[PDB]
Design a protein around this nucleic acid. Structure first.
Ligand SMILES: [Zn+2]
Lengths: 134, 129
DNA sequence: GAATTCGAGCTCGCAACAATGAGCACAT
DNA sequence: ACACTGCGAGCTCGAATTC
């Protein structure tokens, strides 16, 4: 049972890892999807942990070896069409996503400059307190 | 605040102003829960264990709350080192409906769980925080 | 009526995560 | 084809007295 080509098949690379009825003949390696890791689904499409495992339907992942560790731990992989379908479900339209990213991408450079004034107001407080008194 | 036995449905959002005006014209509002027979709520298995013996000043405060076999919304002022929390668990053990405990701090909700496990015989799947 | 001081809570981002040892019970 | 549990940041209140 499929939906893209409608063929009857027992199992494929999909529908046992992501629950998607898609045959393994074409498989669309760079056509319909890619394999996006977990850390790219948090900083690009801006989803918290309450979006990948609590919003119905909860989507699952694939564990694999870490590329630059080889003895340490995991590397989770998600299906790319399942992420951008979830980002449209959590954040209204697609033209609300990047517009929310502009006010977020300025908050780190706001932290970059507000770190540099508390470093001024504290180091100048140590020398102004010695001259104000008498 | 709108929308023998004459009744009219009042609005939930301004139940505070209705209690202000009902005292303002000397026909006050009572909150006597008649909990022995309501037939809507699923009475849970909260039961006071026979280890929490309550002192005679706590037995006098609960006697004024559950007066005629019907619970009453009031304020009980006991000292903190005194049994201020055991009267709370015993009042939840007597109405035996869905309690809801509120505290001021996140440390205070870590204690009410530790008092409901000491004197009330509840599983860990029902004392949620 | 609009500030303060010091406290509280809830959201949420930030940065970087680890995993080292040794033996007798049950079938024809 | 990276990344778990902890933790100070804003934000908004509170009590009581201030400016
Ligand atoms: Zn297909």
């Amino acid at each position: 049972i499929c939906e893209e080509c409608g063929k009857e098949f027992m199992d494929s690379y999909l529908m046992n890892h992501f629950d998607l009825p898609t045959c393994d003949n074409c498989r669309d390696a760079d056509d319909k999807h890619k394999l996006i890791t977990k850390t790219e689904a948090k900083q690009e499409y801006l989803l918290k942990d309450c979006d990948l495992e609590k919003r119905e339907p909860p989507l699952k992942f694939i564990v694999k070896k870490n590329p630059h560790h080889s003895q340490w731990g995991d590397m989770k992989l998600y299906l790319k069409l399942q992420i951008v379908k979830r980002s449209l479900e959590v954040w209204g339209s697609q033209e609300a996503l990047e517009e929310a990213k502009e006010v977020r991408q300025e908050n780190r450079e706001k932290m970059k400059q507000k770190k540099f004034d508390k470093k001024v107001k504290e180091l100048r407080r140590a020398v102004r307190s010695s001259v104000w008194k008498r | 605040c709108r929308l023998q036995t004459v009744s009219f449905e009042v609005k939930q959002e301004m139940i505070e102003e209705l209690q202000k005006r009902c005292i303002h014209l000397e026909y006050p509002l009572l909150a006597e829960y008649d909990f022995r027979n309501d037939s809507v709520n699923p009475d849970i298995n909260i039961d006071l264990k026979p280890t929490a013996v309550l002192r005679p000043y706590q037995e006098k405060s609960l006697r004024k709350m559950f007066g005629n076999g019907r619970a009453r919304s009031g304020v009980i002022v006991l000292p903190c080192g005194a049994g201020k929390s055991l009267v709370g668990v015993t009042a939840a053990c007597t109405v035996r409906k869905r309690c809801l405990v509120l505290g001021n701090s996140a440390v205070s909700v870590e204690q009410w769980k530790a008092q409901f496990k000491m004197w009330s015989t509840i599983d860990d799947s029902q004392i949620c925080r």
